[PDB]
Every structure is written in C-alpha cells, then in structure tokens.
Amino acid sequence: DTYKLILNGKTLKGETTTEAVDAXTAEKVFKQYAXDNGVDGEWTYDDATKTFTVTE
C-alpha cells in the first residue's frame, strides 16, 4: 500500500511516499529518508491515512 511521510525540519520541510508491504518497512524507509534529510525528531503515525510525520 502507499505510505506517506511528512517531514517538518528546522531548516526544511518535505513530503514523500513509498509503496510498502507493511507500515514496519515503510517506517524503517522513512526513518532512511528523514537520514537523507538530516532530520531526527518526534515521530507519529496516522493509520487512517497511512501517513507518518516527523518533527525536528
């Protein structure tokens, strides 16, 4: 299924999607993507919209 990430960084913002078998693999892609963007922070997931958010 399609999973979405919302990134709220101190210096940047972003949004991306990935196709994954489970919300496990999507989280462990997004928690590499937020790696690529130098963003570490507080993480939440919304099952309704399959959307993760990280805020620095």
Q: Can you put this structure into words, describing what you see?
A:
With 56 residues, this protein is mainly beta. It has one domain: Ubiquitin-like (UB roll) (Roll), CATH 3.10.20. Helices cover 9% and strands 43% of the residues. It has one helix at 24-28, and strands spanning 2-8, 13-19, 42-46, 51-55. It has a four-stranded mixed sheet with strand order 2-1-4-3, with no helix packed on it. Strand 1 and strand 2 (13-19) form a beta hairpin. The longest helix has 5 residues, at 24-28. The protein is globular, with a radius of gyration of 10 Å.
* Record field, number of beta strands: 4
Name the structural class. mainly beta
Q: Please write the CATH class name.
A: Alpha Beta
Largest sheet: 4 strands, mixed
CATH fold descriptor = Ubiquitin-like (UB roll)
The figure for the number of domains is: 1
The helicity comes to under 10%
Give the second-level CATH assignment, the architecture. Answer: Roll
Cα-to-Cα separation, first versus last residue = 26 Å
Order of adjacent strands in the largest pleated sheet: 2-1-4-3
Tally of alpha and pi helices: 1
Principal-axis shape equals globular
* Helix/strand order: EEHEE
Q: Roughly what fraction of the amino acids lie in strands?
A: 35-45%
- What's the gyration radius in Å? 10 Å
PDB class: de novo protein
Keywords: unnatural backbone, de novo protein
Assembly: monomeric
Entry title: Backbone Modifications in the Protein GB1 Helix: beta-ACPC24, beta-3-Lys28, beta-3-Lys31, beta-ACPC35
Please outline what is shown here:
By secondary structure, this protein is mainly β. Helix content is 9%, strand content 43%. The N and C termini lie far apart (26 Å).
